[PDB]
Design a binder for this molecule. Sequence first.
Ligand code: M7Z
Length: 141
Amino acid sequence: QCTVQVRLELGHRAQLRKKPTTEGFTHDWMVFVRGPEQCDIQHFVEKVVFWLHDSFPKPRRVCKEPPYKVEESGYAGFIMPIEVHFKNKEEPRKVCFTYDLFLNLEGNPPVNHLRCEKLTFNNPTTEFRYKLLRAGGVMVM
Ligand SMILES: O=C(Nc1ccc2nc(CN3CCCCC3)[nH]c2c1)c1ccc(Cl)cc1
């Protein structure tokens, strides 16, 4: 009997692009998944898949190691499925987040947003427990 808790941070930055008036993309943005400082989520994260809007070239963006991030230009915000896959041999194998990638419209200052997620693993295998603790995970009885 034990629970191991680990922390993910999802976030994004967005700002106006300065290029020619005839390039349609108004914004640069960057979306990420990371650990808190001094945690190494690579120990328990196999890969992160960012599912961009269908209009993007190769919209299924895979990061198999850090940094887990996509840097793009665009003309609109959208809802981004973000899948974090685990180095786990049993369930759960992954978690899906629905990430609100919104841009700064109407001359508002840049977006710099963080969304903090706690993952709770009940009774993980010996092996996966060690990966979670190795990543800076916390046990509970
Ligand atoms: O912004 C949107 N679509 C889009 C489409 C194609 C794009 N190609 C780039 C430029 N990159 C190409 C690959 C290499 C790096 C540069 N940015 C794009 C953005 C979008 C967002 C939300 C809705 Cl609802 C609809 C459309």
